[PDB]
Write a protein that binds this DNA or RNA. Structure first.
Ligand SMILES: [Mg+2]
Ligand SMILES: [Mg+2]
Ligand SMILES: [Mg+2]
Ligand SMILES: [Mg+2]
Ligand SMILES: [Mg+2]
Ligand SMILES: [Mg+2]
Ligand SMILES: [Mg+2]
Ligand SMILES: [Mg+2]
Ligand SMILES: [Mg+2]
Ligand SMILES: [Mg+2]
Ligand SMILES: [Mg+2]
Ligand SMILES: [Mg+2]
Ligand SMILES: [Mg+2]
Ligand SMILES: [Mg+2]
Ligand SMILES: [Mg+2]
Ligand SMILES: [Mg+2]
Ligand SMILES: [Mg+2]
Ligand SMILES: [Mg+2]
Ligand SMILES: [Mg+2]
Ligand SMILES: [Mg+2]
Ligand SMILES: [Mg+2]
Ligand SMILES: [Mg+2]
Ligand SMILES: [Mg+2]
Ligand SMILES: [Mg+2]
Ligand SMILES: [Mg+2]
Ligand SMILES: [Mg+2]
Ligand SMILES: [Mg+2]
Ligand SMILES: [Mg+2]
Ligand SMILES: [Mg+2]
Ligand SMILES: [Mg+2]
Ligand SMILES: [Mg+2]
Ligand SMILES: [Mg+2]
Ligand SMILES: [Mg+2]
Lengths: 157, 236, 96, 130
RNA sequence: AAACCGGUUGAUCCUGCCGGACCCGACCGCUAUCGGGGUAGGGCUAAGCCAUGCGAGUCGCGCGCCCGGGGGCGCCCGGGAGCGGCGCACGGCUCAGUAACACGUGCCUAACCUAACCUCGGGAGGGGGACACCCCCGGGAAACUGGGGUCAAUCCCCCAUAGGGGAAGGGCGCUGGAAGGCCCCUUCCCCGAAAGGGCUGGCGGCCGAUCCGCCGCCAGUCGCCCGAGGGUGGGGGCACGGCCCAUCAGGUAGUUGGCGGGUUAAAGGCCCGCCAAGCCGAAGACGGGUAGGGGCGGUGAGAGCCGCGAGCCCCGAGAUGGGCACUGAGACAAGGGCCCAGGCCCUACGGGGUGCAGCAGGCGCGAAUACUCCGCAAUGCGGGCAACCGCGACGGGGCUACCCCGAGUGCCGGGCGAAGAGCCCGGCUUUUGCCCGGUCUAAAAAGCCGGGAGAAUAAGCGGGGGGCAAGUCUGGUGUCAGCCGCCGCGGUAAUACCAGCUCCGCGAGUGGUCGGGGUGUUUACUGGGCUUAAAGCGCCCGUAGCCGGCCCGGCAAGUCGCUCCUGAAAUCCCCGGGCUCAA
């Protein structure tokens, strides 16, 4: 008798104890470097990071036969998004993946890391006002997680 | 009578969520609701000739579509296994055949085998005059004299002439023929009949098919004999 | 629940503390039972009158029972005449 | 007929003897029944054709005078006449009120016969001589 | 992230509760710019009462009549009131009854019916009638309704034959696991079809402009009747599965079964006549309480717990309470009928209507709630040969802090300011707000594309003694007022109250009270404890239950492995793709 409704997708990266000093210090650093809007964006990055790690955890627990069809395609898909660097690492190497690798794929970060803007908050403003063309199309969402192949197509107006 | 989109058969080539809350309901024709597709769905989805339901009804209303030699002007007419669908103004012919992916597919066929339909004998009844009536997998019937109808047992496949209302060729169900699975998980598979575990109910007998050397098993109910090493009519 | 204020009554804080927590007696409309409701905030009792509809709500505390030094009271006033008491106390609105 | 006065639906009693509630408030018309229509001994035959479920028809004998008595020892059928109802083993009150039911004895012209049809349902009295 | 932290002591180790931190659901407070996706909204409250409107029609290719325009061959077209066919038993709403063959899964009907439709085989001959609209009159407040005349049918009826039912005897034969079945033969009884109708074209004949038809035939097409099967819908049956209470222990008497009957479409104590004493129960009857069942949903690392098991889909039941019938394939019928109860409404006092658990809407209750809006374009359905028509189903938007997703409320440099806020200066951009055009949309709206001015139009909520991030800064009060989930403060120097300044958390949100889960190994299967903290019956005999020595042989029930038919869709996990990414 229950009707399904959507739930928050950033809950997996949300800490259940927000009032930790060292926790507040580390997260405040991350928002500063990458110019995020609120902690929801930061938690949304971690929720992606938990997916990549929890999926890799389960694939380790799967049998060798079961792991085989999914092992290489999983690493290859991670490589193409730009999270990882080698798509041929051991599967346990993905377990130590760090949340900054997901934050670098944000479209706002790439505009700043490509020297296309003065500051990271300026690069967010560039995407917001619609001066950043991704393969010729205006992509105005600064939190866009650009994959590897699309990265070289980023231009300004 | 309505048909909610949720209650539509799973294998139908329509989106499950996106669309209206309704689906076109077949009008009790020569098939089963679970194993038939209405004519308006075929004209709109499988052939893509109509973009709306009114356009599909318009195409059907002109008699452009022929199903087994009879022009069907009903947009809720059911189509099913081994049916011959012919589009008059374009001249294309299809035979709805068991498919490994779509579960039921419109395959083009040559014009020669368009009047032929392979029918599986579902049973026989004794009618007045002492004659025998044959019931086929799509509910079609054929009355025969008693001696000729004695030698056609159930599950035998007969190639039926829609043009002459006759039996071209009778294919008995014996071990060693070519069979196609017409229902169940193993649909679309064509292979040799080489193994049977005869149960107390013959319709529930376990049968095995081989294609060198992928072996699939089903029940005896779910396989149609299509002949010896050469299939009699194009199905794949 | 809703209720009608009858008399402004004062209960005394428990032994270690010393104060007169100012509550009111309310009769519930849906039941007719009479309950003692705590009026919070400094001067919040002054916004209460006799025969005014107030929205009665639980005071919190463990297990839905009474609060810390207030003995035997389970409810507190949140609304007076259809306006929130915190709004009146903060000046953001005025009582009707 | 389908009459709620002769409802043929299930009891409200469990096999343990305890009572159970009513799942359905109304009496379904499909589960309805009808009053008896077994014929009475009369001076002429009157047949009534009744429309029943699905647009079908049932032949009702309102008043019975002749019986199609059959002689097993001779293999002949005679449309003999009926004089009295000797006895009704299912219920004597059928014979007491001159009502013919299956299994009843009838003292026909040829002798005695046991009624071998359901005269409220078949609509004729097929009899076999004793 | 498989997590702990506060509090009983002078101090300590425990036990054990209560609190904090998290997610979701309802209601509420303060605040509130934009967009996208979504089956969110009087459910958790009275199945309480209702003003008003809209909510099932369609067919002239079944039928006659009337009217208007046109034309001569035999009519064309438009319209009207009707008869007639089919549909209105689908669709929409709600959750009282129900602890039950209601629901779920897996099987049956060899004990059954089914209009529309599909296939095979066969048939369509003879003869009659009535009633509407209409015309001449009405009656009545209205509802409704009377008499005479008069034209038809795919309207109604009869006759024939086919066919059908029953009883009885026989059989090679069929189906099927198995014939009380089908087929064939014989005897009797009984019931008993049809619309060759419409259209199109061709032929011929009768007839006449006061007719614009009628008749025979042929073909095409849409139809009608019978037999058999299928299909669909439905009636019925079975095995098993899913709440609490013993401060409820015996219950049942058509009750349990048998035989013979009636009724039914069909089996049945469904009902009836007779016969017996059986049937259920501590493996929990009976009684009470609660509840529509499922797909499923929330929460947790999981086992599990809970139902927010309201919204979407499937089944069920209901239409103010309780009953009973007509028609029909199907109802004992939400916008049909009749009766009782209980209301209300109009009235000319003689009557006649009505019950919104339909879509809007009003009153009422309550802590708690939307427009008396637009369209049949999409998705479907009924009707039609078709064209097309209708549809508060459905689609569209409005309102609403409904759920999720993406953003703004500026960016760069400089000075003052503190490295903050803020102020000012110089340069930049226009997401967004405003105006306009194209596109979109049934039409709007919003979206999208493009153009103009412009920093210009846009931040709150809760907190700073510990738990727990944030002030031993200042003013005021002085165990008063106030705070406080717990611990605990305040009685003159208050980091806990009221204020200023300042800082903290989250941010178009943030809080308060509730409910569920975690918390919690405080329900313990995983996985607790019982000497003394709560907890071994005072002791023993034993029924059900649970648990039980060794070896050999058999079966293969459990169990294990593979495969098949299944376990609706949606929901869930993984993978690919398409909306700018996202949802
Ligand atoms: Mg306390
Ligand atoms: Mg835990
Ligand atoms: Mg102490
Ligand atoms: Mg607790
Ligand atoms: Mg309600
Ligand atoms: Mg017609
Ligand atoms: Mg008309
Ligand atoms: Mg009509
Ligand atoms: Mg319904
Ligand atoms: Mg008359
Ligand atoms: Mg007729
Ligand atoms: Mg028969
Ligand atoms: Mg006749
Ligand atoms: Mg006639
Ligand atoms: Mg019987
Ligand atoms: Mg009984
Ligand atoms: Mg609703
Ligand atoms: Mg009633
Ligand atoms: Mg009714
Ligand atoms: Mg009502
Ligand atoms: Mg439409
Ligand atoms: Mg958001
Ligand atoms: Mg400075
Ligand atoms: Mg517009
Ligand atoms: Mg503040
Ligand atoms: Mg302060
Ligand atoms: Mg601290
Ligand atoms: Mg505090
Ligand atoms: Mg314990
Ligand atoms: Mg002892
Ligand atoms: Mg004791
Ligand atoms: Mg013992
Ligand atoms: Mg076994």
């Amino acid at each position: 008798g229950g009707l399904k409704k959507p739930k928050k997708k950033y809950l997996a990266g949300k800490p259940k104890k927000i009032w930790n000093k060292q926790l507040l210090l580390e997260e405040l650093q991350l928002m500063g470097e990458y110019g995020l809007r609120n902690k929801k964006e930061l938690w949304l990055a971690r929720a992606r990071l938990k997916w990549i790690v929890r999926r890799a955890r389960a694939l380790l627990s799967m049998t060798a036969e079961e792991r085989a069809p999914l092992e290489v395609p999983f690493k290859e898909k991670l490589y193409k998004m730009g999270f990882i660097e080698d798509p041929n690492v051991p599967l346990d190497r993905i377990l130590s993946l760090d949340v900054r690798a997901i934050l670098e794929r944000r479209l706002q970060t790439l505009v700043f890391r490509m020297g296309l803007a003065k500051s990271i908050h300026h690069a967010r403003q560039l995407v917001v006002h619609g001066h950043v063309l991704v393969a010729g199309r205006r992509v105005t969402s600064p939190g866009f997680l650009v994959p590897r192949e699309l990265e070289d197509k980023i231009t300004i107006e | 009578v309505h048909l909610r989109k949720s209650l539509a058969p799973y294998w139908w080539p329509i989106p499950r969520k996106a669309g209206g809350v309704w689906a076109v309901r077949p009008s009790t024709g020569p098939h089963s609701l679970e194993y038939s597709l209405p004519l308006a769905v075929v004209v709109r989805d499988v052939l893509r000739y109509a973009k709306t339901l009114r356009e599909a009804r318009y195409i059907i209303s002109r008699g452009y579509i022929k199903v087994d030699g009879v022009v069907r002007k009903d947009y809720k007419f059911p189509i099913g296994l081994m049916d011959v669908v012919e589009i008059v103004p374009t001249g294309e012919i299809y035979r709805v055949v068991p498919d490994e992916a779509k579960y039921y597919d419109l395959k083009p066929i040559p014009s020669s085998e368009a009047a032929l339909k392979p029918l599986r004998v579902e049973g026989k009844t004794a009618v007045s005059g002492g004659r025998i009536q044959l019931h086929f997998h799509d509910g079609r019937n054929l009355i025969l004299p008693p001696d000729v109808g004695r030698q056609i047992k159930t599950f035998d496949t007969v190639v039926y002439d829609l043009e002459n209302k006759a039996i071209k060729t009778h294919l008995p169900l014996r071990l060693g023929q070519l069979a196609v699975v017409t229902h169940g998980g193993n649909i679309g598979f064509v292979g040799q009949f080489f193994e049977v575990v005869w149960t107390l109910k013959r319709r529930q007998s376990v049968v095995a098919l081989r294609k060198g050397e992928e072996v699939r098993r089903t029940i005896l109910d779910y396989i149609m004999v299509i002949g010896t090493e050469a299939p009699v009519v194009k199905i794949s | 629940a809703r209720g009608i204020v009858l008399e402004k009554v004062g209960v005394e804080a428990r032994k270690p503390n010393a104060a007169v927590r100012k509550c009111v007696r309310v009769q519930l409309v849906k039941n007719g039972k009479v309950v003692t409701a705590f009026v919070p905030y400094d001067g919040g009792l002054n916004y209460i009158n006799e025969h005014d509809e107030v929205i009665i709500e639980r005071i919190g505390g463990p297990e839905g029972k009474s609060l810390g030094d207030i003995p035997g009271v389970r409810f507190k006033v949140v609304k007076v005449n259809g306006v929130s008491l915190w709004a009146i106390w903060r000046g953001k609105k005025q009582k009707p | 007929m389908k009459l709620g006065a002769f409802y043929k639906g299930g009891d409200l009693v469990k096999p343990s003897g305890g009572k159970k509630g009513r799942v359905r408030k109304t009496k379904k018309k499909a589960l309805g029944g009808g009053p008896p229509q077994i014929p009475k001994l009369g001076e002429e035959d009157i047949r009534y054709v009744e429309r029943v479920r699905g647009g079908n028809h049932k032949v009702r004998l309102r008043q019975a005078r002749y019986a199609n008595v059959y002689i097993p020892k001779e293999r002949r059928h005679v449309k003999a006449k009926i004089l009295s109802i000797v006895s009704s083993p299912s219920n004597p009150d059928y014979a007491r009120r001159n009502y013919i039911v299956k299994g009843a004895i009838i003292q026909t012209e040829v002798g005695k016969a046991v009624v071998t049809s359901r005269p409220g349902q078949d609509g004729v009295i097929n009899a076999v001589l004793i």
